[PDB]
Amino acid sequence: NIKGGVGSFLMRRAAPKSIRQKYQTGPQFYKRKFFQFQKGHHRLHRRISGVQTGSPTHQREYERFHHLPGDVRTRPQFDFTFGETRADRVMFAWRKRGDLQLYQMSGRGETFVCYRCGYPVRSQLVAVKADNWDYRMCYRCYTNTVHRGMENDT
Amino acid sequence: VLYDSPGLTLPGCFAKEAGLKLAACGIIPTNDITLPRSLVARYIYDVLSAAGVGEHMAECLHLPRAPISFDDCISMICERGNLDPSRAQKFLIHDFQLGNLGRI
Amino acid sequence: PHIHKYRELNRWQRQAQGISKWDQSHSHRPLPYVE
Amino acid sequence: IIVPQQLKAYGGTFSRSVGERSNHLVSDVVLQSLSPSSTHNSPLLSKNIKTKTVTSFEDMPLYPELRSALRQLRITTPSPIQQSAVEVIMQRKDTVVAAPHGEGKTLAYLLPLYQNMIKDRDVYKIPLRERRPRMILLAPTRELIAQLHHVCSVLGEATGLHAISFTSRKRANHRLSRLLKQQLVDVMIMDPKIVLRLIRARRVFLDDLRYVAVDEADGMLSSQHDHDAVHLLMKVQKRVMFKHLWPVQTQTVFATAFITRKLEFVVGKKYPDAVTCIRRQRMHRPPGTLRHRFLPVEREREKMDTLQHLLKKHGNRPREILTDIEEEQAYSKPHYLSGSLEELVELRGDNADEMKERVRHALEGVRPVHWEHLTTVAAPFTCHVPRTVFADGKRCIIFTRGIDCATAVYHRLRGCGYTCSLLHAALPAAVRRRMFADFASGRTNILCSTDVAARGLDLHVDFVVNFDMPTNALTYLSRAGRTARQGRLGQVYSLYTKRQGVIVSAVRAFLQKQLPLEGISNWKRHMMEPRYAEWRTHKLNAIARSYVSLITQKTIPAHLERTYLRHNATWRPLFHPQTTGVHGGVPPRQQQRVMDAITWKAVCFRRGLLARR
Amino acid sequence: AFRRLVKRHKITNNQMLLMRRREPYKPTMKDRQEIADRAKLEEFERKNAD
Amino acid sequence: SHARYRPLSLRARQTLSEKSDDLQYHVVTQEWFGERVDSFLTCHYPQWDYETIKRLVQQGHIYRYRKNGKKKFTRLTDRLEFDELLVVPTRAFWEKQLAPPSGVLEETDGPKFKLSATAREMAHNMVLFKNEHVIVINKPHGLPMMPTDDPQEMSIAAMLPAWKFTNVAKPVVCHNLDRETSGCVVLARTRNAHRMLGRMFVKRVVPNSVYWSFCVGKPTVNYGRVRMHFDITRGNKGDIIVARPSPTKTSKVAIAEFVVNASALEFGSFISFYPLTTRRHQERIMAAHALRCPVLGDAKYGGDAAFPSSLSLFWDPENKGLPLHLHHRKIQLPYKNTAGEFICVTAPLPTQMEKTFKKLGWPCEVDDPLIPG
Amino acid sequence: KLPAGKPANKSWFRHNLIIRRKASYRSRWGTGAEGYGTGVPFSDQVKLHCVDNTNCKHVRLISKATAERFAHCRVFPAVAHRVSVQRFKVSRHRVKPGNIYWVCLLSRRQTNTRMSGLRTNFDRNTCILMNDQRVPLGTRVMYCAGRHVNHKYHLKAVVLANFFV
RNA sequence: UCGUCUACUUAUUACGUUGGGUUCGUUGUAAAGCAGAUUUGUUU
RNA sequence: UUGUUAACAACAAAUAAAAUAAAGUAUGAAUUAAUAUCAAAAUUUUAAUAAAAAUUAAAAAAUUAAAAUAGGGCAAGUCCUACUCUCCUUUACAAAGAGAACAUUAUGAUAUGUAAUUGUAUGUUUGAUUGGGGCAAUACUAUAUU
RNA sequence: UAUUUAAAUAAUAUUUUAAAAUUUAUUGAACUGUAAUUUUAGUUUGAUGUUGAAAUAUUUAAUUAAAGAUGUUACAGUUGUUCUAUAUGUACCAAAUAAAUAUAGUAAGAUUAUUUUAGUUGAAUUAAUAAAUAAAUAUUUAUUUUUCUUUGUAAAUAUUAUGAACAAUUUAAAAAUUAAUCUGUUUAACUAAAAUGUUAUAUAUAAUAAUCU
Ligand SMILES: Nc1ncnc2c1ncn2[C@@H]1O[C@H](COP(=O)(O)OP(=O)(O)OP(=O)(O)O)[C@@H](O)[C@H]1O
Ligand SMILES: [Mg+2]
Ligand SMILES: [Mg+2]
Ligand SMILES: [Mg+2]
Ligand SMILES: [Mg+2]
Ligand SMILES: [Mg+2]
Ligand SMILES: [Mg+2]
């Protein structure tokens, strides 16, 4: 009958459907409406990167992220570089901090979605929750989770 | 005015005898894997030869004699030649469907 | 102001639909009336 | 052969509003945004904003006379606006009292301004002279002036201060001058146009003027009231600059239900240090207990038949007209209702006061207002005409457009057998007072009025009927802000046609998502076209959501990885979004290269098809 | 709507290569707008004192 | 009994939170000024679990008021401010039409089922893969996954207390199968493991499981996709399933990619299904009607056609009680092994399927490469 | 296209059933007369005669590979394509079309070179019906059995056959 | 989250016949849940 | 392997033998062309393939053939929602090229009108501030009344 | 009404190519279309050639119809093929030829001349009765007033559309890192001088070991 016109950009304010999504009171389990990326980036994902300065003989692979705080400044407990190469190219694995364990991948950074921040992250550092590789965390959220003490909760 | 009930009356997963009757009356297709022309023509021959209707079946199918067995009837339908027993079974099924065998 | 109908459609929408420019409304050609 | 331009990036058009949404409109029509991303550049709302509250009235300093005035008004717990604004005004600062309709905005600035006058009268002992008042109140309409005079008289009875009001009457220059000659006043509740006339006629002086309160300041400071308040405030401001009289710091208070561009700039540029008390999470929204209902009428003629249905639905039953004498008496004799509290409570179904308040809550539909850790009941209406007739039916105001429609609907309902009263400005002074007194006292439960009764009227209106759909949200909120007052149950019926279908779809959508009615108009192109940077924001968020859905559920081969991220995960800017409606958001040099390839392949395919035909 | 073609200045000290703003002791745009508003308001009040 | 709870949108939930007065306001005094929200709540509610407190705070049922006129939703790691209020719902707050999270109310176990020695032995025998978080069992044919309408029948839900080897609580089944379907069934050992694995059994885009079936007749195509739309209606003593090619509002889609691995000429076929949805009797319906090849022994869909006389040398088509030739073969898990590949659990073929494969000359135990590891 | 990341061949199970040979210059099937191991095995959908006194006349092979070299270590299932009609009427007569039995291969029309160098071209393709226990349904064989039949895998077949080559 | 459910009952007798009436439940969740799609090889 | 017929069709495996289509002597275009006597490979990273950077590493010359990469145009495909265009309908809005009726001379013809309230195709048909308030002769000094 | 003080009277100009339907006047039926007269082929689609001996040849399959050829007449775009539609009216059907700076709220692209000689780098934003004042950028131009030092203040002119949605805090500071608070980036006479930072520590609520209840 009677037709009117209202743009969808006026309703985008009501996009979040819960307290967790509107006020960010917890981890965004792949349910995030508003994203904040650096002004100028076209490929919309966050990047936790490392600096390579030498050969694997002098500079180890985990020493690339030494400029970051946390467990990347310690040597890992497990090392898979020697022997049969991992199918997913996991080079190192740090000690389990509660339900989270930090891994380092080989090759170009794989773009995954951290369930705590909700952002697509491209990095070689992946924190797996309870050995379940469906729930991964970027290294930044991993360091923040350990700092607050929420390692066994999130 | 008329209201139609789409999925109220339907054969669905039928029994052996019900499927034989439906295929003999032409309600369901004859499947070359599950419901064979051979089985449905065997059913037709059995229900016809239950009573003394062998000579009448031969008269309807233009057979030189009253058939003793279903295989003999199929072979005589082939003779009435280049056609195969499959074609003979098809002819018998279609004759029963059109009513060339009688009212039943 | 304007009185035409296609004024809500921009030049891109007009050329995508296939409409002639309504601003150049030429009237020297009569309409195909049933004579 | 004809082939259109195939490659496009955006086919629509972007609005030219570079400042904010609805930049082309006037402030009198559109409401301003209250988001911090928008108020960051505003001259008023980027400055200091008061948000802290005070729980009880005992925690704030009040004189015993003001304590008794609150008990007389039956008010115990302060509303969120009073919890924040009373303290700032008592600190003698220019304050912008911003609150929705029916939250105690009137008493929010009357209590502190009265206490400051008591302190100047008792502590500082500033003498009151003949033609030099202490406070000046500014109100738009005549009924609001009479209503503000009623509240100031309740406060002035206990505090000892004398408030005076004046509307236009016969021989007004004579009657107004006698008041200034016979009695001494310190509160002048008048119109800014008339008080400017007395100042220029040298009947009232700006000496020892310490307080200027502007109710409904969003409109008073706009051109809809001829900038009379703005001209007066500039005279008050130059009085403060005068250094040969005693030092008076005249503080100015602005009570508003809306915030517009006029209000922000006229206060932010003229009052640099002005504290704003506002909760942006409730400001531009209807009350929670208000029920909205949009009834579409297919034909404009059938609008009267729909209105008559709503009246019969809510108890208002018309008297039967079956004879010629009754048909003549329907228009001649003004019929009035009759009843009392005793018979009405018998019909519906110490201890004396508790029962009077129990019936008062059941009739007005008063629900306990729910604030955080604070709950109260709504005080009785502060109207200068107390209700004395209680008949069987729901009370209503029928807002129409223009004066002629209000007059016509008034006579149509009378001919049908309805007891209604007409209220607009064209009525004479005697009839206008009588017509409002009939509805406010209870002799009439149906008020056919124009937009004059939309701002500042605390009446027992059970439901409101918009006979003509308002053209903007500012008028929509003010009209509907009459039936739900302090947690009372209210209902609104808006009759609209196709010509207002755009704003109805906008308002109906904003209400369902519980959003502020900011930037709402009736122009369809304005409500559908976004800004480029706003479209860019929602586009970037949509791209990131598609990236999440692509990563977490899809496995992509290596040869498809490049194209998947190009179409689902890459922010691709547009080319000159100002002229997007011409080149489609794609550089025409790229379009020329694309069109060259397609045209060549189209010509080759056409030459073959023509040769085959 | 500012100058996209940056103004060039003769570099006499090597720290001019590092400094981005021409006059660092000068208040920012909005700050000096507020300063000008305040100064003009004070001058207007002085003019209206009598 | 939770029978008084109603579906509520965010608006209605906020309105009920505003209206309901069943709230407690803890005043943050000097002694608790500066503490964390989770610490404060754990010290003030010893009867609540940390999971319950976390759910309440993160969903917004517990909030705080800083005397600003609005409610403030916070994280468990936020510090408390001086002279503010902490609003926590009481017991009576959840007695209205608003359901609380799982940890708020207290459930009662009540009865405890008893499992015999033979039952526990067969439950231990059915185990295929065990982990710190998951247990994959081999459910056989004819065993119900859940208690049926007849309470006297055994079920995996009743045998569940037999797979708590060292844990305190019994595992929880992550996905259910039909009574006739036999194959790998996943049981989460931890509550968090179940909450994380539930994501794996909802509709997806990439398949992570295989169904090996023996269908009567060979379809016209070797591989392809099947998409139907099922509408379930309540009948007299059953459910009427209406399959449509076009979607309806009351329908739900069923999608699966099928590949015919090997087959007889035109009388029988071996087909691998890779589903993307979870619909009742999905594989059986898509085989009987979409592929037009009823599964061997599927008497519910194509009864007389599910017992072909072509296999009369192997299976007698007169008993009509042979097990369904549909087996949940292989399933991938989110957990990785030492080599770096996702752990894929495979179940051996049942007796009837192995017999059919051996009679037709096909290898029974073959790895299906279409589901990687 | 499964898997989605690295799509693979959907004939993985067919590869376990077929006996293929890349048609390079070093690997070739050729005709059976080239020597031992040069005959192409019978593919599926191949018609064979049924020479035992059963109701069946022709069978169709289900196996993807069928030859004499591995007639002792592989099972050959087949379907009764054509059945003799008895106009005037046991287990051997109860053979109905569509049924699936195993078949013992007796001879082929293709050239077969033994290891001794003796090539042979029989008149027609030949086989006999057997059950899952490798017991022939017929009581007599109306054709010649090949030398490959002389194996313990075909004990009852050798007993029922009366002539070998 | 791919559960299960063409038989009970009021009577009648005999070693099946004849008249009436007609679902249960495991687990998770209070959103981190609910329709449909989830495709891309200038191999032109 | 499937049909016709009393040799014909394609096919899958030995797709194998065997037939025709060379450099080189001559003549000699066209698409293309930012470019260092171009840069094998691996790794790390940077604003969308990055050949852009950095770190490891160590990559010959000439002729032939290959589509693995670069190069050769691509905001695309499916679903849902909303708006519009298009297209139909007439009873109202503006124009309508068709006809009428009327005035004037004649009861015979050509025209002019100030007379046209008829019709069929064509245009349009959702920005209402073109509103609502306020102002209301009898100044000034006084008097009485409700 | 006319109480207030100057002056160098000179006008003609104002990038460029394009961004589209068209206006006025003609032409075209040797191509193609219809009527009158003197195994072929069409349609669909795949398969070879891909500037091909062809600016349209050959082939596969299905389907629909089958008196064969040439020329000449009449019909011309406002439309013609005597209803409409498709198709077509001479090698891109808004047909072709001749004139047009006719004009596109105007999409975009180019716009000829080193060694230079001075102010701001994210502000401003009030439709509409007596309210001191928009701001940035650029060109000309004007104010030597105090002081311990420092201090780009103002007119007359030209232009201005480079475009953000939520949340938190705030009459004081996001300090909630799942938060950014945003205009980048280029900028260098020569020779010298010159102060700057990435190393790892693998065991102390730890590690290595025995007795016994
Ligand atoms: N603290 C309080 N408790 C209960 N009732 C109150 C309180 N304060 C005010 N009220 C009541 O609220 C009513 C409306 O007050 P007020 O006139 O201030 O509303 P308003 O915001 O000015 O509305 P509008 O903007 O429509 O004029 C008054 O009649 C008064 O009785
Ligand atoms: Mg008010
Ligand atoms: Mg035989
Ligand atoms: Mg869904
Ligand atoms: Mg018309
Ligand atoms: Mg029309
Ligand atoms: Mg010709």
Ligand SMILES: [Mg+2]
């Ligand atoms: Mg025509």
Ligand SMILES: [Mg+2]
């Ligand atoms: Mg300047």
Ligand SMILES: [Mg+2]
């Ligand atoms: Mg200036």
Ligand SMILES: [Zn+2]
């Ligand atoms: Zn993260």
